[PDB]
């Protein structure tokens, strides 16, 4: 009974797999190799010649995990060396040395899948499928704004799927029950008028109450949220950002970024407050079952954001099965409520 039966669409989006700090801590070299799991796939990350690559975590020779091998160099070029019989892979996933027969000549069969991989906002992003060429790395505002300061949090795992995490983050009606002593609900028992737009691959909506502020959401699909809070009294802004990464069928790894105006307060005060909130949501959201969004779930008027999110996920899931042009239309066609 799940809404989103086919997951092929998710392969065409950029997903975060770890923070840059997490990547550099994964191996004593500071350059990997490191193992991550994305959409059920086991990937290896390694920094070769100052660029982080993402490849299949599976040597073509005898299937050892490259993520427990080592980054090594020859003639000023870096390679990912297998831990087992030492085959070396370059940034494109081509095996450039078989040490057992080094003269050579290396079969084209000796090659692993190499994937789109870029560092942005001090997070490592991977896109498994290039074919449809219409997705970009999720939007975050003010990372480079010199009036503000950034916290890139360590990532955290929830035992639910990424859709449940996104719908939790964009919902206010649960504050009275999940967050009663922690978060004030500025809309309780209200039905604010909220227009939901699709603009350039993003869900965009704005919430205003009837200290008070506005809530402006830019949400790169399928799993990101950029929440701009603008205070009414004064023009001070606060950005809370999260993206859920679809690790596998039962978990997601979540990346939080806090952007705030410079203040001489300890960063840990802001991180610990968000952790306190996260720890209130976590057991409620992990109790939701089945994990996958189900068609039988009952939506009411205040679930407009969630309904629009589910609608676009379903359409994207179907469009990707249809082919390149269907998908690109679904991603790129703007839809302004009116």
């Amino acid at each position: 009974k799940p809404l989103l039966e086919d997951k092929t669409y998710l392969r065409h989006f950029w997903h975060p797999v770890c923070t840059l700090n997490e990547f550099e801590r994964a191996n004593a070299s500071g350059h990997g190799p490191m193992g991550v799991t994305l959409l059920g796939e086991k990937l290896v990350l390694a920094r070769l010649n100052s660029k982080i690559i993402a490849a299949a975590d599976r040597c073509a020779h005898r299937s050892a995990q490259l993520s427990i091998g080592r980054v090594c160099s020859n003639a000023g070029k870096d390679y990912l060396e297998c831990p087992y019989h030492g085959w070396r892979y370059d940034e494109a996933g081509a095996c450039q040395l078989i040490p057992a027969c080094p003269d050579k000549s290396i079969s084209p069969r000796a090659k692993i899948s190499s994937f789109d991989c870029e560092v942005k906002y001090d997070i490592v992003w991977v896109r498994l499928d290039n074919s449809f060429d219409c997705t970009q790395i999720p939007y975050l505002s003010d990372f480079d704004n010199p009036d503000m300061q950034v916290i890139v949090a360590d990532s955290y795992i929830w035992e639910t799927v990424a859709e449940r995490r996104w719908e939790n983050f964009t919902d206010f009606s649960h504050f009275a029950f999940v967050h009663p002593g922690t978060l004030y609900d500025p809309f309780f028992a209200s039905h604010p008028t909220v227009y939901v737009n699709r603009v350039d691959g993003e869900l965009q909506f704005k919430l205003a109450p009837p200290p008070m502020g506005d809530f402006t959401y830019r949400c790169t699909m399928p799993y990101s949220v950029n929440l701009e809070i603008k205070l009414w009294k004064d023009d001070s802004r606060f950005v809370l950002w999260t993206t859920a990464s679809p690790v596998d069928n039962k978990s997601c790894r979540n990346f939080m970024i806090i952007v705030r105006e410079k203040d001489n307060q300890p960063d840990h005060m802001h991180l610990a407050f968000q952790k306190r909130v996260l720890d209130e949501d976590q057991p409620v959201i992990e109790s939701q079952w089945p994990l996958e969004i189900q068609t039988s779930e009952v939506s009411v008027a205040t679930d407009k954001i969630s309904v629009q999110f589910r609608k676009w996920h379903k359409e994207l899931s179907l469009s990707a099965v249809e082919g390149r042009e269907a998908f690109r239309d679904s991603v790129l066609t703007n839809v302004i409520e009116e």
Copy 2:
């Protein structure tokens, strides 16, 4: 190769899900909500307006577990409140308040399955399916006999199916091997004459040896045993009762009740002795594999009780698939050996 392929029949019987004490200890309120699993189904128990209800542990809105919510009251009526967005359910499983849009009007889709649920012998019983209206809560003797005193034991889990637990409880031929230093076998190497009757939904049989006593069994199907021990010298009686609850495909939760004549002895002496016996049976019974009763198992003459138990289970399993009248006939038709 299992004897009892279809489990639909089990839904029509009353099964114990927890003791009353267990239910009251599950939540600081003393009124739940509490989670239990019955026949693979996740249920929530809560005490609303002095009655314990059993419902599906799954909110209709976004599938959160109601069993981690709270019992709350409005205008003197109790409700089961979801932990996530606060929908309130009444004793019938109808949602009576959506706090996001409270004026209202609540869709009929906003409703969870509510099940038969009654407290008897300080145990909580649930029946998942009403349709065939021919089963009752298992028989226990002397709970209200003012000459005797009762112990309702905490329940315990065995990693086997409920049929294996029942056949273990009604068998004497294993005493010499499982219980040699603990229980005397009054029938060893004997073949006592035992008549097995079906009477009003119960297996009934009596065992007599050739301090000594008689063993009178009334066994409400599918998983209860009421064992009356009447001593020969004197007319003193002792009741040992158990029911196995079919939690899921690999475990059962077992409920023991001891009824004895008042004696000024500590209850713990009787409980600890039964635990000692249980701990001798447990690893032998949990070693039985496959867990499910298999058709290839070899029965001999002394397995008459077990064979009659398996026969009636198989007939009940088939009758329930056939329909209401077939099932009611199988449950209700008495069969006296002769």
Copy 3:
């Protein structure tokens, strides 16, 4: 995508299930019963009348595990007694006493499968299927050579399949990467000429470098290796032997034997060195995925041994499905490279 889809062939070979010491330590009696798992089957070992038998670990009466029962004797004959209702089994798996009705007469249905089982080199070997009568217990050299001394190591589990363990043991090209500070590679970047023969159920090959020695392999199929190391300077020999037992679809239990010329050195020095090597291989080999050999794996010239191993495994797997004569031909037909 696995190379070896059908596993029926493995049933026709002798596999080690435990060392003799392991068997004697499994039960306070020193005679079992003991539980082992072979090819996914649960077996019971017990020593009855001075011979270790192997049978199905499943009583025919009510399916209790015989491996938690006891070896008992009646009239000078030993029996395997079930822990539950005491049925006694003889060395052939026939039930010889039902204590509930002992006079008697025991049904032929009351019988468990009994398997080939022999102790050799202080290891317990089992063969599940007799039908094709063409396999023998793997070859080990010098167990009885009075100039040498033997270590039969405790067995160890790796979380991989037995083929991966065998290919690891017969490969030198991984030394530079897995064993750099522990084992010298006598062939690095060389392509020694290696002839691989099939002789009397064994893969046989010899490796010579261009202290130095020769490496002479006799490898009883499907999973044994007898490695004779003969030093060039002097004629001193050292035997390293291993057999991988196919426990189940995700693990193998490995048996090592070291045979060396008598030396007044502590055996633990030799065992600990081999453990150090094993601990270097273990995480690399356990990283290989999928566990099962896959057809897509890329073999190069230096994998000749592994390729010949995979070839004969595939042929054996197909021959066994074809029937007795096909299998016997595959096992017994010698093939000398030329």
Copy 4:
């Protein structure tokens, strides 16, 4: 720097060592033997001929712990049997059988200290020293009041000394900081007029605010509190009682009893609420150091109860060192504030 340097006085009071239920659960017999520690002394409890005795947990023969032996009977008399060589002790601590030389005659040296021991309010009380004959078992009200119902809680350990636990229980000024979301402070920033009397071995005081109620304390020395709460609106009463047992120099074992008017509410609701309060106090009180009351601690006006408690403890500590008449005067002399 501790206030109460000498602890001899504590030996002359009755202290609770376990609940009756705890005693009956300690051994499968329901009659002990059981081990407890009181004032650093290791004691054995056993029920012999329907009376629980307390003795030194140390056999006179070779110093084995009697608390791991067994209660046994001979000629209708119960004995405490040593686990080692079987010496039997009667209720007075006299050895009545040496099984190695049973004819006999038992030395008077073969004898263990036996102590005052009585069950009251379903709690086991022990008094180590009889000599001064002026102390009684602490006061609890309404245990036998048929309009009310009693909960005797399982005991709990805090890692502090018993004086700290008592002063915590009789203090309201910590509610705003330790219990802000749990307990309302009816006296915050007030200085109610409180008269503290010494009456018949008890500290007695009453607190009234300026639902509301009165707080009437009768506090048997050295470590008990009986708190009667009488509501203003209506005459309904609620009794909260606790006694701290001085286990050793770093811990106390605490006994709580709740007495309330009959109400058809689950007992667990009242127990769980008190546990919630206890869990707020526990880490704050366990942080107090040094554990022992120190002379340098700074008392203010609102510590009147604590100051009077410390005064009488110090006087009792000195009186006991002085002798029988000094102690009896300190215990028994009433002192009414005026």
Copy 5:
């Protein structure tokens, strides 16, 4: 048999108690309060009005730990609030509010010891005793050098005393045995000429071999090391700094800082390499017993640094017992070898 019997001298030096990051992570507020132990004393750290204070972790009222209370504010001034009855302390350790009697007037007895406390190099330093006014916060070079970048490592505990940690850090003769595969020894079997000076409270010495570099040590007493490594080929410098904090009689908490020229390498590569070295030293140094430096230890010529360190520690230990002028002379008198 210990060299340094009297520890009073250590109270007069600045010791690091935690990194700034560690302090800010200790409490969700980012401002403490936090608990640390220095020279056996329990201290509380809290940030009040933008300055971190250090005080005795013991409320004057009833001895609760202030480190589990909270930083609170009144009328724009911050206070350290006790968790128990809410007494508030200012930066000088004076109690400024007793909430039970707030009008007021607070006794001078209501006061806790307040200690010297300053943040330098992103580390929190405490000096317990001011009296002799001749010590300063240890020397570290290049923290503010804009051509270089700094790593302030998390602190780590070793189960040894701080003298053993210092002597380990300033010694090269152990490299061949503790660090054979990790650190090259530039002086092995050499006796370089090393002059050891006392200059302004520092041990100063320089080591030169006969890539290569010079080793210039400035070592603020009693437990700091600033190691400047200047490469011969090129003038590039690398600073490795450590200070051992005397936590108690059996452990020290160690603070490492790495200063290096900017390089676009990941900081984790440098941290992980130092951890690898630390993990080689740790079990050897923790094996040294007795922990305290003993007079019987045998020094050879290559222990010149250690001998001079022990000499000055012994003299400082004696001078502090003698009085202010003796100590100030020992700390401040320069001694140039010649």
Copy 6:
């Protein structure tokens, strides 16, 4: 209140510190070094030039534990190398190389205590003090008897002192209570006539009942027992031997040897039976308190062996304090009962 206040005497006896197998397993080399504790002293064992030495586990340079260093060789001579700065010790405890200044000349201060150490019965024995030259390695019979076979068990720790272990091993009156279902008592309620002799450093006594056998004890002081069991029917003998090693003030390490006539039974059957007995004694003996033998313990007639054991221990303890001749007289003077 302990009987044996002074422990100096124990230093003059040979004590077992580990089995030979235990020593060879302690380090991958098979030659140590290994750490043991004897009479509170930390010792290092290492095999140098085919002989195991015992020395103080404390390097003279900077007090590192030699037991975590390594056995190394130079010019065909073995040395114990310190893990810290590499000082090498020979079999006499003299430092023969300081690698920092190797030319040399090594101070006589650079030397560790070296102790008597010999392997006998595949056990490592150490004697800390030579001075009185009158003790030998405990007696065990039949180790070299070619009609019998030996089991040298792994050693085991009990949390009691060695005297309690010895008295437990030589006592039959506890069988009925500690071993009721495991060991038959051949003397229950009997007072067999037992003569206790002191012969050549041994307690010697023989016990005969009124399958049956004689029990002949030769007990080398202070802690060994050689029990010869000779069956009446037939002349078959069975030797059970144990020695308790005084590890420290709260524990002993116990060495068991079983010698039996050759029988084709598994050794594990005999070991497991003795472990079953040991596990019955262990919690009773560990309950004995105070651990040290106390003067107040009450001995009866059947404790004759224990009383004679305590007498000779007390005399030995006093004699050793008196001097060489007193001790030698106490050890060597035979005393035949008559």
